[PDB]
Amino acid sequence: TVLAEKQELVRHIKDEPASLDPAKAVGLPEIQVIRDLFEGLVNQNEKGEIVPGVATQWKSNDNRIWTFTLRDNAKWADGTPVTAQDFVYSWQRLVDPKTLSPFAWFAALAGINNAQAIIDGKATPDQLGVTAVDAHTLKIQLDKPLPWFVNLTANFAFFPVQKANVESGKEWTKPGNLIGNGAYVLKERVVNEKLVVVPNTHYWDNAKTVLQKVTFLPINQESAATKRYLAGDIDITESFPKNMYQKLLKDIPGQVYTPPQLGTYYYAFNTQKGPTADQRVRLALSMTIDRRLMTEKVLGTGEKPAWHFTPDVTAGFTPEPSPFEQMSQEELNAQAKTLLSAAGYGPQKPLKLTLLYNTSENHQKIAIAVASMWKKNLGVDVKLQNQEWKTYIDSRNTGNFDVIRASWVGDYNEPSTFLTLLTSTHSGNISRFNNPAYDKVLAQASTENTVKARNADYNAAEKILMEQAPIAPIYQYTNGRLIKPWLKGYPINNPEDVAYSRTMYIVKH
Ligand SMILES: C[C@H](N)C(=O)N[C@H](CCC(=O)N[C@@H](CCC[C@@H](N)C(=O)O)C(=O)O)C(=O)O
Ligand SMILES: [Zn+2]
Ligand SMILES: [Zn+2]
Ligand SMILES: [Zn+2]
Ligand SMILES: [Zn+2]
């Protein structure tokens, strides 16, 4: 009675998705779509709490051996059942060296038995600690107790894929070929323009799905996206131009949202070669970024300075104060000069750097401003390069850029999601930071069984990141979005921004 006749949605995503295969996805452009096409053992509600997915229950006596009960009537988009074996197959495939998954390490973070040996080729994938006891009963064996293990199963990397589909060949993820178990099915795609999905009528909870079509529109120039939103072509954006914020608040109050998100923006230094291999160069660079200037003037949509890597909002985290947070920029800038001269740069040998970022107005403005801070305080010159998301994600692992722009949004709500990114066994370690003390302190944290004791080690880890500056944290994210008043059910207050079109609906407008 309150619902519109046409239950169709146009959703903006910032970039063209790199891959719709859960085991080859790495960032939010893909991931946003994958959550409509596939479904894990569990989902997240709007508060970020764990709720039933394929599983209706999950039990553990010791937080090490976990048993999931699956629903009888979970289905793939081809009407076949979703089974425990599907998961066995999909998680072996995640760790299988043949897959080259950029999330293989996630199975090791979970502590699933034998994950690291399999990733390293020392054990076969059937040695993984995951068993189908029957079609509806999946039993997982972890190395260590992990109270939040179930949370990890809401993460895309643990979504099931269908073997027969996967084994039909390299076009399996094309429109009309891709068979997943989520609320929607891929109907149409044109590269760089649109992805269109309609409901999987076999999805167990299809009775509740409202939206009959959702079109995702990738547009990496935030101005062009907001322009289409104001014109009425887009019902919800991802981000918006920072310089339009006050005018947006003014013209469309109620549609502008900027809650705190579990993610951090940062620059990665090459710790392995070039000038950035010297700890003093890195520290000078990081100290010279004026974080309150950035968040106040260049951003101003509620972002906070990142003095530590892990976001303040992260459940279980009580940071110790940083000594940079308490200094003035003047002090910071002068120490930075001292450090760089000790490194041996100045008029006698000026510092030249390359920086990669992925195409975006925001990243371009932040790069210009960082480069200005460095020019001005340290006499550094930076050659900028921009590349679209899908190309950036490979160029950055090439060892070729002194500075690389990036973010990390948490795969679950606990500090290890952040701090493990800098361990030597983590594929997403862009700086190639390889510090045995650092690795060992996080391995210890994972054996601890109180929040306080874990937090002491996570603090020790953050200290090493301050001392060695392999990366420069810049800011803590907000989930900046424009949402039309008639779009309901978007989980705008989920700190991880985990959303499924199946919760959304359109009111008469
Ligand atoms: C998903 C994984 N944990 C991860 O963080 N991957 C990151 C990439 C994660 C990723 O897509 N960030 C987005 C986050 C944007 C947040 C959004 N509110 C905004 O304000 O724009 C980005 O940079 O635009 C990696 O591979 O580099
Ligand atoms: Zn049965
Ligand atoms: Zn069918
Ligand atoms: Zn803090
Ligand atoms: Zn409309």
UniProtKB/Swiss-Prot annotation:
One of its GO terms (molecular function) is oligopeptide binding. CDD domains: PBP2_OppA (cd08504). Part of the ABC transporter complex MppA-OppBCDF involved in the uptake of the cell wall murein tripeptide L-alanyl-gamma-D-glutamyl-meso-diaminopimelate. Is involved in the recycling of cell wall peptides. Binds the cell wall peptide L-Ala-D-Gly-gamma-meso-diaminopimelic acid. Can also transport ordinary alpha-linked tripeptides such as Pro-Phe-Lys, but with much lower efficiency than OppA. Cannot bind typical tripeptides such as Lys-Glu-Lys, Lys-Lys-Lys or Ala-Ala-Ala. This is Periplasmic murein peptide-binding protein MppA. The complex is composed of two ATP-binding proteins (OppD and OppF), two transmembrane proteins (OppB and OppC) and a solute-binding protein (MppA). It comes from the Bacteria. The lineage of its organism: Bacteria, Pseudomonadati, Pseudomonadota, Gammaproteobacteria, Enterobacterales. Changing residue 396 to A: Cannot bind murein tripeptide. Its main location: periplasm. It is found in: Periplasm. Keywords: Peptide transport, Periplasm, Protein transport, Signal, Transport. The keyword Zinc does not apply. One of its GO terms (biological process) is heme transmembrane transport.
